[PDB]
Amino acid sequence: SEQYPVLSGAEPFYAENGPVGVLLVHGFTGTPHSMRPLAEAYAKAGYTVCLPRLKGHGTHYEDMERTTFHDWVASVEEGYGWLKQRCQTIFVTGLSMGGTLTLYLAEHHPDICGIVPINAAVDIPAIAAGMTGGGELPRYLDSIGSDLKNPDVKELAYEKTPTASLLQLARLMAQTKAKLDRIVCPALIFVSDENHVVPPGNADIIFQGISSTEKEIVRLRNSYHVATLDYDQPMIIERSLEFFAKHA
Numbered sequence: 230s231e232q233y234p235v236l237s238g239a240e241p242f243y244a245e246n247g248p249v250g251v252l253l254v255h256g257f258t259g260t261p262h263s264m265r266p267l268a269e270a271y272a273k274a275g276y277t278v279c280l281p282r283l284k285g286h287g288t289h290y291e292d293m294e295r296t297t298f299h300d301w302v303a304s305v306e307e308g309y310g311w312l313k314q315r316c317q318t319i320f321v322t323g324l325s326m327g328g329t330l331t332l333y334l335a336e337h338h339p340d341i342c343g344i345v346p347i348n349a350a351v352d353i354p355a356i357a358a359g360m361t362g363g364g365e366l367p368r369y370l371d372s373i374g375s376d377l378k379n380p381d382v383k384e385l386a387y388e389k390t391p392t393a394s395l396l397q398l399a400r401l402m403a404q405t406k407a408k409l410d411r412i413v414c415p416a417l418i419f420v421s422d423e424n425h426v427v428p429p430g431n432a433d434i435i436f437q438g439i440s441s442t443e444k445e446i447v448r449l450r451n452s453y454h455v456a457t458l459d460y461d462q463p464m465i466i467e468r469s470l471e472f473f474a475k476h477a
Contacts, residue, residue, distance in 0.1 A: 239287025250316035254323030409438030
């Protein structure tokens with residue numbers, strides 16, 4: 230149970246429109262802020278939209294510290310269920326760990342129409358390494374800002390990362406990576422060529438691992454990791470809309 234109140238800007242976003250739905254998943258220590266411009270664009274295009282707030286996110290990092298990856302999965306599952314009550318057709322898109330959760334969801338549901346992971350994380354060796362090796366880490370790691378090309382964007386995210394939450398992320402990534410072959414729905418995979426957080430190599434692990442018969446990669450050349458708020462935002466939105474229309 231969250232002990233801290235939800236912060237302004239971190240609210241989930243819902244829009245009831247047509248029978249085709251899009252689930253949007255934000256990232257680790259992040260908030261719905263990172264996916265909001267996408268959610269709004271898709272809503273305006275006539276899609277039913279669900280952008281949930283991950284448990285322990287958008288409140289306080291102490292809440293986050295208390296969560297496990299199961300809680301984050303449950304938050305996304307709640308959004309899937311909300312769409313299930315309203316939509317004949319469901320797409321899922323997500324940034325970073327949101328992309329990881331997008332893959333995870335496609336691995337455990339048979340009726341997802343398509344996925345759009347954006348810089349999804351499935352293998353970050355430094356993380357598991359540090360959780361089981363190296364020296365003892367502080368309880369909280371200091372955030373020093375978001376990986377963005379555009380300097381004038383401020384992402385709404387925690388100023389500290391609970392180290393305990395890193396193990397949860399590592400477990401989520403490991404279990405998602407192991408089950409990639411269960412994914413059969415069409416996939417549009419975005420990857421930033423320059424990325425200082427997730428190795429772009431992850432996109433290939435995903436591309437090769439999934440069983441999808443229709444899969445594509447779009448390499449973004451004008452964005453860093455937080456691409457949804459970076460210069461390539463218009464392309465991400467446009468290509469995603471084309472993807473939704475192609476498969477619905």
